[PDB]
Amino acid sequence: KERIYESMFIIAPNVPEEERENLVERVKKIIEERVKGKIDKVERMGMRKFAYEIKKFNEGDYTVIYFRCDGQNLQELENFYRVTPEIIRWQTFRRFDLEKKERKAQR
């Protein structure tokens, strides 16, 4: 069956908010068209302060995207992040807990 992932990415706070929203849209399209993932949820968490600096910023605009795919093209997303300096931090995780939960819901 398909695997469930989260990807959280943080946009630098000196990027205008409309450009921030466009970056979000670009990430969605990378997941849809390149990862070949189905998006389940986009959580726009908005601006949040860090414990200590990241790339010399003290805050950044958080988004988490929950998606499912076959796990074979995840590098498409990683490679988008690698070339996009406006995204100052990201992390992508397979959500085994959510896969287990779904199997449980189904029975």
Q: Which residue has the tokens 């896969």?
A: 99
What is the per-residue DSSP string for 33-88?
III--EEEEEEEEEEEEEEEEETTEEEEEEEEEEEEE-SSSTHHHHHHHHT-TTEE
Distance CA 94, CA 68 (A): 9
Please give the method by which this entry was determined: X-ray
Q: How far apart are CA 5 and CA 49, in angstroms?
A: 25
Resolution (A): 1.7
Q: Cα dihedral sign for 75, 78, 82, 83?
A: positive
Which top CATH class is 1-107? alpha beta
The Cα 107–Cα 105 span in angstroms is 5
Buried b (16+ CB within 10 A) or exposed e, 2-32: ebbbbbebbbbbebeeeebeebbeebbebbe
CA nearest neighbour of 45 among 14, 81, 15, 7: 7
Residue at 60: amino acid letter: G
14 DSSP assignment:
T
